[PDB]
Amino acid sequence: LITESTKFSDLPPQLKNELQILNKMIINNNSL
C-alpha cells in the first residue's frame, strides 16, 4: 500500500512528480 510511514524514495513516480509541484507551490508563497 501507500501508508503515511512510506518514504519519499518509495513513491510512484507520478505522485513523486505531483509532490515536487506541491513543494514548489509552498516555497512560492514564501517568495511572495
Binding site: 501507500i2 503515511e4 510511514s5 518514504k7 524514495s9 515536487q20 509552498i26 516555497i27
Partner: protein
Amino acid sequence: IGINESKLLEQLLNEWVSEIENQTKNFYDQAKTIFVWD
C-alpha cells in the same frame, strides 16, 4: 527544494500543513495591512 528521498510522507505532510497555516495567517495580516493603506 526537491524533497529529501529519506523523509517519511507523514513528516512531509505535517511540515507542509504547519507552513500552510503560517502562510494562511500572514496572508490575512498582509491583506489587512493593504486594506489599511487603501
